[PDB]
Structure formats: structure tokens, C-alpha cells
Design an enzyme around this catalytic site. Structure first.
Site, PDB file in Angstrom:
ATOM      1  N   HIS B  19       0.818  -1.193   0.000  1.00  0.00           N
ATOM      2  CA  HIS B  19       0.000   0.000   0.000  1.00  0.00           C
ATOM      3  C   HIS B  19       0.865   1.262   0.000  1.00  0.00           C
ATOM      4  O   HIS B  19       0.493   2.264  -0.587  1.00  0.00           O
ATOM      5  CB  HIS B  19      -0.883   0.092   1.243  1.00  0.00           C
ATOM      6  CG  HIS B  19      -1.857  -0.983   1.451  1.00  0.00           C
ATOM      7  ND1 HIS B  19      -1.660  -1.935   2.418  1.00  0.00           N
ATOM      8  CD2 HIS B  19      -3.052  -1.226   0.914  1.00  0.00           C
ATOM      9  CE1 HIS B  19      -2.704  -2.743   2.435  1.00  0.00           C
ATOM     10  NE2 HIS B  19      -3.562  -2.318   1.550  1.00  0.00           N
ATOM     11  N   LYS B  43     -17.874  -5.501   9.882  1.00  0.00           N
ATOM     12  CA  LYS B  43     -16.936  -6.373   9.173  1.00  0.00           C
ATOM     13  C   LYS B  43     -15.603  -6.497   9.928  1.00  0.00           C
ATOM     14  O   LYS B  43     -14.562  -6.739   9.312  1.00  0.00           O
ATOM     15  CB  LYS B  43     -16.646  -5.507   7.937  1.00  0.00           C
ATOM     16  CG  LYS B  43     -15.655  -6.050   6.911  1.00  0.00           C
ATOM     17  CD  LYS B  43     -15.946  -5.646   5.459  1.00  0.00           C
ATOM     18  CE  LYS B  43     -16.221  -4.169   5.219  1.00  0.00           C
ATOM     19  NZ  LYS B  43     -15.022  -3.418   4.773  1.00  0.00           N
ATOM     20  N   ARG B  92      -3.648  -6.996  -7.895  1.00  0.00           N
ATOM     21  CA  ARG B  92      -2.556  -7.958  -7.613  1.00  0.00           C
ATOM     22  C   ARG B  92      -2.765  -9.274  -8.349  1.00  0.00           C
ATOM     23  O   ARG B  92      -1.764  -9.872  -8.764  1.00  0.00           O
ATOM     24  CB  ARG B  92      -2.673  -8.427  -6.162  1.00  0.00           C
ATOM     25  CG  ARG B  92      -2.277  -7.469  -5.020  1.00  0.00           C
ATOM     26  CD  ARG B  92      -1.773  -8.139  -3.744  1.00  0.00           C
ATOM     27  NE  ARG B  92      -2.570  -9.172  -3.064  1.00  0.00           N
ATOM     28  CZ  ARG B  92      -2.524 -10.460  -3.375  1.00  0.00           C
ATOM     29  NH1 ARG B  92      -1.417 -10.976  -3.881  1.00  0.00           N
ATOM     30  NH2 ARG B  92      -3.585 -11.223  -3.190  1.00  0.00           N
ATOM     31  N   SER B 130      -2.747  -7.754   3.257  1.00  0.00           N
ATOM     32  CA  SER B 130      -2.951  -7.565   4.688  1.00  0.00           C
ATOM     33  C   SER B 130      -3.268  -8.916   5.343  1.00  0.00           C
ATOM     34  O   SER B 130      -2.608  -9.328   6.303  1.00  0.00           O
ATOM     35  CB  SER B 130      -3.997  -6.514   4.972  1.00  0.00           C
ATOM     36  OG  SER B 130      -3.558  -5.210   4.605  1.00  0.00           O
TER      37      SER B 130
HETATM   38  C1  LIG Z   1     -13.570  -2.897  -0.752  1.00  0.00           C
HETATM   39  C2  LIG Z   1     -13.271  -2.194   0.586  1.00  0.00           C
HETATM   40  C3  LIG Z   1     -13.750  -3.069   1.756  1.00  0.00           C
HETATM   41  C4  LIG Z   1     -11.773  -1.930   0.764  1.00  0.00           C
HETATM   42  O1  LIG Z   1     -10.929  -2.920   0.077  1.00  0.00           O
HETATM   43  P1  LIG Z   1     -10.040  -4.009   0.893  1.00  0.00           P
HETATM   44  O2  LIG Z   1     -10.885  -4.461   2.041  1.00  0.00           O
HETATM   45  O3  LIG Z   1      -9.658  -5.016  -0.143  1.00  0.00           O
HETATM   46  O4  LIG Z   1      -8.662  -3.327   1.443  1.00  0.00           O
HETATM   47  P2  LIG Z   1      -7.037  -3.537   1.504  1.00  0.00           P
HETATM   48  O5  LIG Z   1      -6.478  -2.451   2.362  1.00  0.00           O
HETATM   49  O6  LIG Z   1      -6.637  -4.935   1.879  1.00  0.00           O
HETATM   50  O7  LIG Z   1      -6.568  -3.260  -0.018  1.00  0.00           O
HETATM   51  C5  LIG Z   1      -6.644  -1.890  -0.538  1.00  0.00           C
HETATM   52  C6  LIG Z   1      -6.438  -1.870  -2.039  1.00  0.00           C
HETATM   53  O8  LIG Z   1      -5.018  -1.855  -2.369  1.00  0.00           O
HETATM   54  C7  LIG Z   1      -4.653  -3.015  -3.089  1.00  0.00           C
HETATM   55  N1  LIG Z   1      -3.422  -3.585  -2.519  1.00  0.00           N
HETATM   56  C8  LIG Z   1      -3.235  -4.085  -1.261  1.00  0.00           C
HETATM   57  N2  LIG Z   1      -2.021  -4.552  -1.068  1.00  0.00           N
HETATM   58  C9  LIG Z   1      -1.372  -4.349  -2.275  1.00  0.00           C
HETATM   59  C10 LIG Z   1      -0.065  -4.640  -2.723  1.00  0.00           C
HETATM   60  N3  LIG Z   1       0.874  -5.234  -1.991  1.00  0.00           N
HETATM   61  N4  LIG Z   1       0.234  -4.310  -4.000  1.00  0.00           N
HETATM   62  C11 LIG Z   1      -0.724  -3.752  -4.753  1.00  0.00           C
HETATM   63  N5  LIG Z   1      -1.984  -3.457  -4.446  1.00  0.00           N
HETATM   64  C12 LIG Z   1      -2.242  -3.774  -3.175  1.00  0.00           C
HETATM   65  C13 LIG Z   1      -5.821  -3.995  -2.984  1.00  0.00           C
HETATM   66  O9  LIG Z   1      -5.809  -4.854  -4.109  1.00  0.00           O
HETATM   67  C14 LIG Z   1      -7.023  -3.047  -2.833  1.00  0.00           C
HETATM   68  O10 LIG Z   1      -7.555  -2.492  -4.028  1.00  0.00           O
HETATM   69  C15 LIG Z   1     -13.935  -0.804   0.629  1.00  0.00           C
HETATM   70  O11 LIG Z   1     -13.744  -0.237  -0.657  1.00  0.00           O
HETATM   71  C16 LIG Z   1     -15.410  -0.666   0.994  1.00  0.00           C
HETATM   72  O12 LIG Z   1     -15.887  -1.326   1.915  1.00  0.00           O
HETATM   73  N6  LIG Z   1     -16.128   0.201   0.287  1.00  0.00           N
HETATM   74  C17 LIG Z   1     -17.462   0.669   0.663  1.00  0.00           C
HETATM   75  C18 LIG Z   1     -18.543  -0.398   0.594  1.00  0.00           C
HETATM   76  C19 LIG Z   1     -19.337  -0.526  -0.697  1.00  0.00           C
HETATM   77  O13 LIG Z   1     -19.858   0.458  -1.236  1.00  0.00           O
HETATM   78  N7  LIG Z   1     -19.419  -1.787  -1.183  1.00  0.00           N
HETATM   79  C20 LIG Z   1     -20.353  -2.316  -2.171  1.00  0.00           C
HETATM   80  C21 LIG Z   1     -21.050  -1.279  -2.965  1.00  0.00           C
HETATM   81  S1  LIG Z   1     -19.758  -0.417  -3.889  1.00  0.00           S
HETATM   82 CL   LIG Z   2      -8.313  -7.427   4.662  1.00  0.00          CL
HETATM   83 MG   LIG Z   3      -5.047  -5.598   0.848  1.00  0.00          MG
END
Ligand SMILES: CC(C)(COP(=O)(O)OP(=O)(O)OC[C@H]1O[C@@H](n2cnc3c(N)ncnc32)[C@H](O)[C@@H]1O)[C@@H](O)C(=O)NCCC(=O)NCCS
Ligand SMILES: [Cl-]
Ligand SMILES: [Mg+2]
Ligand SMILES: CC(C)(COP(=O)(O)OP(=O)(O)OC[C@H]1O[C@@H](n2cnc3c(N)ncnc32)[C@H](O)[C@@H]1O)[C@@H](O)C(=O)NCCC(=O)NCCS
Ligand SMILES: [Cl-]
Ligand SMILES: [Mg+2]
Lengths: 163, 163
Positions: B19, B43, B92, B130
Site C-alpha cells: 500500500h 466487518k 494484484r 494484509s
Molecule cells: C472494498 C473495501 C472493503 C476496501 O478494500 P479491501 O478491504 O480489499 O482493502 P485492503 O487495504 O486490503 O486493499 C486496498 C487496495 O489496495 C490493493 N493492494 C493491497 N495490497 C497491495 C499490494 N501489496 N500491492 C498492490 N496493491 C495492493 C488492494 O488490491 C485493494 O484495491 C472498501 O472499498 C469498501 O468497503 N467500500 C465501501 C462499501 C461498498 O460500497 N461496497 C459495495 C457497494 S460499492
Molecule cells: Cl483485509
Molecule cells: Mg489488501
């Protein structure tokens, strides 16, 4: 805060409604967009560089922040020459995604400043590609719904010339 | 030419080197970046909102164009409240790509102004998530190579408190 410049490279053989959509979306997010039309010196396009540029300028010239340029050689050299912030690509399918991921990493190794951003198409364009369009037109199908009108006519003027 | 503002939403539970890389790359391409930390009201995150924000500000606060904000509700409502140019996501794996493509289209239907841009990770972060980090730490493995040092310590202070 600096001025952003993204390159959108492609053969654009020919430009489709899908490409128009992407370039319009990109033009709202960056200061300059360069539609970079890969000449294809060894790689045989149906339409010439001049035809492809003209078809592109006809669909997108109304956007004041979009330029149109033919290029050959290594995309990273073009990237540096253009002083670009990033390269932009559209991602339609899984195989796109995996090739694009590999190219981004290869390019980042050639030039640590390289960057690649991706957009996904609106669903109404998600099934459209240049290759498939060529194929329908060649078999005398109607491509009006998938390409700007100027491209429709360009296909007729190919049918009517023989090149 | 207007000012660009992209949201990077996520649970960030916890923030990883992956990130950090994405946010740094985005900070060079847009005028403002908002690290948007989804509260997870139903969640169940391991780290609280306050811990997650602090861990993020510790890794990224040195970038002057990055803000940090907790949110809940519909991402499109947050998008409109924030007046954002786009949402940013990292891609990813293939399954990421297909979920992200569907969400972008669903959101574009809820709000025609919505936009989603994607980056792919550098290869040295391509295997980091994560979830996996949580799992190694929980089994007392060493996560130093995959996360900032402040996150390392935060895992110790969880081992040592019990929450
Ligand atoms: C999808 C939610 C939960 C957040 O995403 P997530 O839980 O996957 O979070 P996380 O911090 O693990 O990842 C963040 C983002 O960075 C990317 N990422 C994470 N680690 C890496 C890495 N090492 N390299 C590249 N990209 C990465 C992920 O692929 C992701 O897109 C959030 O957007 C949300 O809840 N939105 C609101 C709810 C909603 O409206 N949902 C449905 C109707 S749209
Ligand atoms: Cl997660
Ligand atoms: Mg992630
Ligand atoms: C990859 C090359 C040939 C151009 O790509 P391509 O031939 O696929 O062009 P095409 O115009 O068909 O597509 C342009 C781009 O828009 C996307 N796109 C096309 N149609 C659509 C659509 N309907 N919706 C969304 N995206 C779309 C494509 O997925 C692609 O990213 C070009 O980048 C190149 O030759 N680069 C230089 C050579 C080089 O350095 N190669 C190897 C070392 S890097
Ligand atoms: Cl092609
Ligand atoms: Mg194409």
C-alpha cells in the site's frame, strides 16, 4: 503541482468506440493526453499511419487536451522523449490484465520512472476490439454500432480501393 | 485545468509496504490523495480505526499531498462527498481484476460521474496482502520485510495487550 501528461499507445487499427470512451475519460483526469499510434513497421496494420491518425483526430479532435502522434521503437524511449507522467492502457479481459502486468514491470526495470495506469471499459464497449471489428467488416457485416461513422466510411473506401 | 483528487479506499488492516508503494506512486500523478480507511462497522477488523489511521500517517504523512480519513457507507456517497476525480485501486491477481471490473461498472451505474483507475504493484510487493500478513504475525512469524516498522511494533503491542 506539475502538469500531467499521459500516453495512450496502441495500433488503433482502427479506432473504436471503446478507445474513444477511454480517451475521453482520461482527458478529464490528466492535463495532456497523447494518442500514440504505433506505426507497426514490421507488424502489418490494415490501415496506414495516416489513415489511423486521421480517424482518431476525427473522433477526438474536439477535445482540446488530446494530441495525436505516430511512434515506433521501444515504448520506454517514447515515454522519456515525451516526458510523460504515465502510460495509460485499457483492460478488457484477464489475458490483457496479465500481459499488461508483465509489461509494466519489464518497463519499470528498463526505466525506474516508468508508470502505467489502467482503466476498465464501460460495459457497452467491453466486447469491442479492433481485431474483431476488422473481421466483421471484412465479411461485409455492419460495424456502425462499434465505431465512429468516419471509420465506417473508411472501411467502404478500403472495399472500393484495394488498399 | 482543475485540481485532481483521488480516493484510495481500503481496510488497511494493517497497511503494508505494498500500500505504501501504491500511495507514493499515486501521489506523484494527482494533486490530492485521500487514504480512505473503511471503518468496517459490521466487518470486524483486527486493528481499530484509530490504530489504522495512525499506522498509515506514520508511513505516509511525509507526503504533503496525502490525507487520511475513515469512512463507512456506500463508496459512491463518499466519492460525491469528497468531490473526487477518481477512485484508485491496486490489482494484484486475476480475481482482484474481475471483482474490481464489476464494482467499477456497478458504481458507474449508481453515479455516472464515478471513475476508477488501477495500478499494478511492483514485483517485490506483488505477493503481499494484509490478510496474509495478519496470518504470519498471528503465528509469531516475522513480518518486518512486508510492513513498515511501526506496524511490526503494533503487532507486538497486540500480542502484549489482548486487543
Ligand atoms: C472494498 C473495501 C472493503 C476496501 O478494500 P479491501 O478491504 O480489499 O482493502 P485492503 O487495504 O486490503 O486493499 C486496498 C487496495 O489496495 C490493493 N493492494 C493491497 N495490497 C497491495 C499490494 N501489496 N500491492 C498492490 N496493491 C495492493 C488492494 O488490491 C485493494 O484495491 C472498501 O472499498 C469498501 O468497503 N467500500 C465501501 C462499501 C461498498 O460500497 N461496497 C459495495 C457497494 S460499492
Ligand atoms: Cl483485509
Ligand atoms: Mg489488501
Ligand atoms: C502494445 C502496442 C502494440 C499497442 O497495443 P495494441 O496493439 O493492443 O492496440 P489497440 O489499439 O488494439 O488497443 C489499445 C489499448 O486500448 C485498450 N482497448 C481497446 N479497445 C478497448 C475497449 N473497447 N475498451 C477498453 N479498452 C480498450 C486495449 O486493451 C489496449 O491497451 C504498442 O504499445 C507497442 O507496440 N509498443 C511499443 C513496442 C514495445 O516496446 N514492446 C515491447 C517492449 S515494451
Ligand atoms: Cl490490433
Ligand atoms: Mg484494441
Amino acid at each position: 503541482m506539475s502538469k500531467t501528461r499521459v500516453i495512450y499507445p496502441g495500433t488503433f487499427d482502427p479506432i473504436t468506440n471503446g478507445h474513444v470512451d477511454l480517451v475521453t475519460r482520461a482527458s478529464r483526469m490528466f492535463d495532456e493526453v497523447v494518442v500514440a499510434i504505433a506505426i507497426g513497421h514490421h507488424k502489418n496494420p490494415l490501415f496506414s499511419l495516416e489513415e489511423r491518425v486521421a480517424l482518431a483526430q476525427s473522433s477526438l479532435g474536439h477535445l482540446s487536451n488530446v494530441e495525436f502522434v505516430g511512434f515506433d521503437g521501444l515504448l520506454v524511449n517514447f515515454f522519456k522523449e515525451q516526458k510523460a507522467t504515465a502510460v495509460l492502457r485499457g483492460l478488457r479481459a484477464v489475458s490483457d490484465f496479465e500481459y499488461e502486468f508483465q509489461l509494466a514491470n519489464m518497463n519499470r526495470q528498463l526505466d525506474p520512472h516508468f508508470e502505467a495506469v489502467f482503466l476498465t471499459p464501460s460495459e457497452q464497449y467491453s466486447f469491442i476490439s479492433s481485431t474483431l471489428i476488422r473481421e466483421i467488416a471484412r465479411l461485409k457485416g455492419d460495424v456502425t454500432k462499434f465505431v465512429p461513422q468516419a471509420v465506417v466510411e473508411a472501411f467502404e473506401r478500403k472495399h472500393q480501393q484495394g488498399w
